[PDB]
């Protein structure tokens, strides 16, 4: 009979074998306790089925023509009124609501938005895989801060997504007093104490942080990176 299709979400979608008379295929779909229905003009899975909650929410699957994303959306009853939409692309997924929008990458690490206000700002967590890091959310960028001592440090995310990472430290003394560079081409943070380097601290493409040590010549490093798993160990490497 129909034919079963996966689908980005964790969804499935049954197509009919064949279309009926106006060259459509109908669809069949089943998420959580509700069951969807619609026609398509491919045969492939793709398309869009639609039902309704017993609360009377309007829920609404659209499936991209070439199956690579997903988009799920529940309405206020007359489904004039979006409520909350959840789209799945890619191994990633955003799911937004009034005042919240959590983005789940590929590799389960987490940014979370939430008390989004209409100027774009909002509160920021960032989840890791051992730890949070934690910050605010303006239209031009989320900034997420970890302070230890007299250091703060900021991982910066553009609107557009680029990372980037300064350190600020109050100590008044030279011989303590932490500045750290920004190396862009390496996604590095490398800290500096009384004009030796000390560390690289690198945010890697798989949303880690590495942390490795300079000689104390300052000027190669030593040993090799650790992967950082909880926040006192950011915390220690600011010290």
């Known amino acids: 009979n129909s034919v079963s299709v996966d689908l980005p979400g964790s969804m499935k979608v049954l197509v009919s074998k064949s279309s009926n008379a106006d060259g459509k295929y109908d669809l069949i779909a089943t998420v959580d306790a509700l069951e969807l229905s619609g026609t398509s003009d491919k045969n492939n899975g793709s398309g869009v089925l639609e039902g309704v909650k017993a609360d009377a929410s309007k829920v609404k699957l659209t499936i991209s023509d070439d199956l690579g994303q997903t988009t799920l959306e529940v309405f206020k009853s007359d489904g004039s009124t979006l409520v909350s939409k959840k ?4 191994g990633s997924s955003t799911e937004e609501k009034g005042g ?11 940014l979370e938005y939430t008390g989004i206000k209409s100027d774009g700002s909002g509160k920021a967590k960032e989840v890791l895989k051992g730890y949070v890091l934690e910050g605010t959310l303006t239209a031009e960028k989320t900034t997420l801060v ?11 995310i553009s609107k557009s997504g680029e990372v980037s990472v300064e350190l600020n430290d109050t100590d008044s003394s030279a011989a303590t007093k932490k500045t750290a560079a920004w190396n862009s081409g390496t996604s590095t943070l490398t800290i500096t104490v009384n004009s030796k380097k000390t560390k690289d601290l690198v ?5 880690t942080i590495t942390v490795q040590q300079y000689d104390s010549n300052g000027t190669s490093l030593e040993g090799s990176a650790v992967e950082i798993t909880k926040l006192d160990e950011i915390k220690n490497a600011l010290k």
């Not at 789209?87 to 890619?90: K, M």
């Not at 970890?146 to 910066?156: I, P």
Request: hydrophobic residues 25%; proline residues 0%; aromatic residues 4%.
């Open 146 to 156: 970890v302070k230890e001592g007299t250091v703060t440090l900021s991982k910066n």
């Open 203 to 207: 945010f890697t493409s798989s949303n």
């Open 100 to 110: 919240e929008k959590i983005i789940t990458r590929a590799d389960g690490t987490r």
């Open 87 to 90: 789209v799945t692309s890619g």
